[PDB]
Amino acid sequence: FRKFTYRGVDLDQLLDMSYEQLMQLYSARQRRRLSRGLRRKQHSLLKRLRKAKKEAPPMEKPEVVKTHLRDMIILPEMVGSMVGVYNGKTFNQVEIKPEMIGHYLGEFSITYKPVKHGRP
Amino acid sequence: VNTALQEVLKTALIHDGLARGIREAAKALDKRQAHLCVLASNCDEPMYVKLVEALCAEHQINLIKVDDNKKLGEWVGLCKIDREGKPRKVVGCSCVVVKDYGKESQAKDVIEEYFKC
Amino acid sequence: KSYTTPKKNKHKRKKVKLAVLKYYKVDENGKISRLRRECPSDECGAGVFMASHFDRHYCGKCCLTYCF
Amino acid sequence: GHQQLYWSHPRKFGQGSRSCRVCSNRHGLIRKYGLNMCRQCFRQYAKDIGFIKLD
Amino acid sequence: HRIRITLTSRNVKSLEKVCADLIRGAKEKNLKVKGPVRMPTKTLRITTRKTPCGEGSKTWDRFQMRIHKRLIDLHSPSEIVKQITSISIEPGVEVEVTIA
Amino acid sequence: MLMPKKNRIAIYELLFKEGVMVAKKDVHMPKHPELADKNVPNLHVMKAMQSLKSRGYVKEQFAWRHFYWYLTNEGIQYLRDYLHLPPEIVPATLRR
RNA sequence: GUGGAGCCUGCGGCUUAAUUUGACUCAACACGGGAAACCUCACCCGGCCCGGACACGGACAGGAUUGACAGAUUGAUAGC
Ligand SMILES: [Mg+2]
Ligand SMILES: [Mg+2]
Ligand SMILES: [Mg+2]
Ligand SMILES: [Mg+2]
Ligand SMILES: [Mg+2]
Ligand SMILES: [Mg+2]
Ligand SMILES: [Zn+2]
Ligand SMILES: [Zn+2]
């Protein structure tokens, strides 16, 4: 009904919040992973995400930008943009709403194919 | 003295002085590293030959004007392969710009004297 | 085996016979006037031309661009 | 260009990163004292290196 | 005066035959010499598998490698010690003479 | 194999100045070890040297991870013919 | 003790783009020094590239053609 709230924080407080401060906010590995940093491969993601939001219509998902980093935390910088996460074979299309922060993009394209035992 | 000019050009090749192709020649003329330039003629180059001629006339560039391109290429002797015989199929070169570290030679001096005459 | 894509072609480089000819500008008098910018580098004090793109300048052997 | 591609994967650690200068293999690298060799080349070269069956 | 020799080697009989020869040479030239101080020799330990593949038996070595140190201290000028030291050494032995 | 013309002439000069040559068989080398003053990555020396071999100029031997090349008199004479040097001067292995 | 039990590892079966491929008493089954995330790696999946040497063709120093700063679907600052 309302705006979301992490511990004492609203999403708007999350969005207009610095990264290291946001680190202290969310979880140890995740705050650490921001403290450690994004490489080239992840930066091209951020720019290509901005261009997709520029080209995107209002009532439409932004265009997909692919990244193989399945091992990658979806940050609020990233929020509101499509990213094609690589499985190895294919790129899975993910729109990243604000609750996605602190999760992997790899999460949304499962590596093992989920099991069904009695198939034949 | 074409045999002497051939020996001088070969010694310049030995010492690695010569700065060649029209473009590197234009560079060497601009840098003012040309002591003599030579240009091919009797070739459909109405603008090219006119440009390089005015470029040499611009500031302190001596100009030899050899006739054929195939002949200039066989003289300079770039892709001489199968030296036990003739060069198999010369491709015609247009321009050569000599830069001369090894100026101390009797053939070079006799050329400077011929130019004096 | 049948391919989806046609094979890709090698980039045919836009060859011009005596391309250096269009670099300098001819005159009935004995001169040359290097119009477009000249590089201030020591290897080409002046003569060598820069690329003239539709939008902004650029230099070839050393690879350098200047946007609008 | 190719210079930013040719060898761009990071080789910082592990028997995968370093390798035997004999095999180029990543199996049994003797890393102590910087011997840097696989159990097979070690077994092969122990006498030359000076190791000995005392006990 | 105080020159300090450090004799190391992989093989033992070479080390003792060389160090004993140089000390005997020192006794001949007559100057204060400390006996060869046998430091305790160390032992480098390695355990490898014979097998090419995974599948034969899983066999293991118990590789030792001893490394022996003698050391000799003399109280004498430098040139005479250079005279004794140049002569009477053999391949296995490694001599390192600290000057002070 | 993209050489710089500078390397073609300096590498032929290297082959001349030391008649023989050794090199590690290692593709994954930023710089060559024995000859580290120039960059000349081992892949460059390797691929040039295998090209020389292909045209008979070097004798091959392979140990551990490391090629070993003996330069023959045809190689000595070809290098001096390319560089137009006199017959007086020589490599250090030829010189005495 | 182990065996019954929860679990470590290795193995079968299945599925899978690929699960490179080997072995089933001893003499397969924490074996491949197999503690493999990528790498390994082979296998597979998109796309480049040739690291197709050397010889000879062509080609051509009136520049063969690599490298190459732009913008475009791209992991990427691949002139792919
Ligand atoms: Mg149990
Ligand atoms: Mg059980
Ligand atoms: Mg095991
Ligand atoms: Mg394994
Ligand atoms: Mg692991
Ligand atoms: Mg693979
Ligand atoms: Zn420039
Ligand atoms: Zn081995």
Domain ranges of chain A: 1-119
Kindly tell me the number of DSSP H helices and DSSP E strands found in chain F.
3, 4
Single-letter amino acid code for the residue at F77: Q
Phi–psi pair at B112, nearest 5 degrees: -60, -35
Q: Which two tokens stand for residue F20?
A: 């023989």
Q: What is the distance in A from the centroid of ligand 4 to the CA of D18?
A: 19
Map tokens 């160090």 to a residue. E19
Cβ atoms A34, A75 nearer than 8 A: yes
Considering all nucleic acid strands, name the nucleotide whose C1' atom is nearest to the C-alpha of residue C14.
G65
- Chain E residue closest in CA terms to D54: E64
Structure-token pair, residue B52: 């390089």
Q: Do F19 and F93 meet the contact criterion of CB atoms below 8 Å apart?
A: yes
Q: Which H or E run includes A58?
A: none
**Torsion, Cα of B81, B83, B89, B93 (10° steps):** 80
Encoded amino acid at B1, one letter: V
- Three state DSSP letters for chain B: CHHHHHHHHHHHHHHCCCCCCHHHHHHHHHHCCCCEEEEECCCCCHHHHHHHHHHHHHCCCCEEEECCHHHHHHHHCCCCCCCCCCCCCCCCCCEEEECCCCCCCHHHHHHHHHHHC
Point out the ligand nearest to the CA of residue D27.
8
What six digits make up the tokens of F90?
A: 């020589």
What SS3 state is found at A33?
A: helix
Answer yes or no: is B56 CB < 7 A from strand G.
Answer: no
Q: What angle do CA E13, E16, E22 make, to 5 degrees?
A: 140
Angle between helices F5-17 and F42-54 (to 10 degrees): 70
Resolution in A: 4.1
**Gyration radius from chain D CA atoms:** 15
F with D: touching (≥3 Cβ pairs within 8 Å): yes
B63 touches chain F (CB under 8 A): no
| Residue C44 to residue B60: CA distance in whole angstroms | 17
Helix (H) or strand (E) holding E42: strand E42-43
Asked whether the beta carbons of B76 and B93 are under 8 A apart, the reply is yes
Chain D CA closest to residue E45: D51
CA B44 vs CA B26, B91, C17, C33, F85: distances in Å: 20, 16, 11, 23, 39
Q: What is the DSSP letter of C4?
A: S
Contacts of A81 by beta carbon, 8 Å cutoff, 6+ apart? A49, A50, A52, A53, A62, A65, A95, A96
Query: What SS3 class is residue A117?
Result: coil
CA angle A79, A81, A86 (to 5 degrees): 105
Are the CB atoms for A83 and A72 separated by under 8 Å?
Answer: no
Which sign, positive or negative, has the C-alpha torsion F45, F50, F55, F56?
positive
Distances (CA, A) of F34 to D17, D21, F14, F47: 22, 15, 13, 17
Q: Of the candidates F68, F4, F61, which has an alpha carbon nearest to the alpha carbon of residue F34?
A: F68
Min distance F4 CA to chain D CA atoms (Å): 15
A19 in Cβ contact with A26 (< 8 Å): no
Domains of chain D: which residue ranges?
Answer: 3-55
Residue nearest to nucleotide G64 (CA to C1'): B91
Tell me the two tokens of residue B24: 């590197």
Give me B13's structure tokens.
Answer: 């090749």
User: Cβ–Cβ contacts within 10 Å for residue C44, how many?
Assistant: 23
Q: Which residues, at least 6 apart from B31, have a Cβ–Cβ distance to it below 8 Å?
A: C42, C43, C44, C45
Q: What is the distance in A from the centroid of ligand 1 to the CA of C7?
A: 61
Q: Is F84 on the interface with B (CB under 8 A)?
A: yes
- Work out the minimum CA distance from B66 to partner chain F, whole angstroms: 26
Cβ proximity of A57 and A82 under 8 Å: no
Q: Residues 2 to 41 of E: which have CB under 8 A from any D CB?
A: 10
| Helix H or strand E encompassing E74 | strand E66-75
- Which structure tokens are listed for A33? 């992973």
CA atoms of E57 and D45, how far apart (whole Å): 21
Q: Is D52 helix (H, G, I), strand (E, B) or coil?
A: strand
CA distance C44 to C14: 24
Judge contact between E4 and E73, C-beta under 8 A: yes
Q: Which residues of C touch B28 (CB under 8 A)?
A: none
Beta strands in chain A (DSSP E): 64-67, 82-86, 91-95
| C-beta atoms of E63 and D51 within 8 A | yes
* CB within 8 Å: F26 and D22: no
Tokens linked to A90:
């294919």
Q: Please list all protein residues whose beta carbon sits less than 5 angstroms from ligand 8, which is an ion.
A: D 23, 38, 40-41
Instruction: Assess if CATH 3.40.50.12280 describes domain D3-55.
Output: no
- Give whole-number Cα distances, F66 to A112, A116, F43, in Å: 42, 52, 12
Residue type, F21: M
Of D7, D11, D22, the CB nearest to F65: D22
Question: If you count DSSP H runs as helices and E runs as strands, how many of each does chain E have, helices first?
Answer: 2, 5
D22 interaction partners in chain F (CB closer than 8 Å): 64-65
Residue D13, exposed/middle/buried by CB under 10 A (0-12, 13-18, 19+)? exposed
| Proximity of residue A112 CB to strand G below 7 A | yes
Angle at A77 between CA A73 and CA A83, to 5 degrees: 60
CA of A103 to C1' of G75 (A): 20
- What whole-number distance in Å separates Cα of residue B99 and Cα of residue B68? 22
Beta strands at A64-67 and A82-86: parallel, antiparallel or unpaired: parallel
Q: How far is the CA of B57 from the centre of ligand 7 (A)?
A: 27
B and E adjacent (3 or more CB pairs under 8 angstroms):
no
Identify the closest residue of chain B to C44 by CA–CA distance.
B27
CB contact, 8 Å: C28 with chain B? no
What are residue E32's DSSP bridge partners? E75
CB atoms within 10 A of CB E93: 22
Q: Find the discontinuities in chain B where C to next N exceeds 2.5 angstroms and give the residue preceding each.
A: none
Task: For the beta carbon of residue F19, count every other beta carbon within 10 angstroms.
Answer: 19
Rounded to whole angstroms, what are the CA distances from C23 to B37, C6, C10, C38, C43?
Answer: 19, 37, 26, 11, 17
Handedness of CA C60, C61, C65, D1 (dihedral sign): positive
Residue B7, both tokens: 């020996």
Measure the CA–CA gap between A20 and B101, rounded to whole angstroms.
Answer: 63
Closest among F4, F55, F66 to F32, alpha carbons compared: F66
Partner-chain contact D21 F65, CB within 8 Å:
yes
Cα(B77)–Cα(B14) distance, integer angstroms: 12
User: Any idea which residue has 């023959």 for tokens?
Assistant: F72
- State the method: cryo-EM
Phi, then psi, of A34 in degrees rounded to 5 = -70, -40
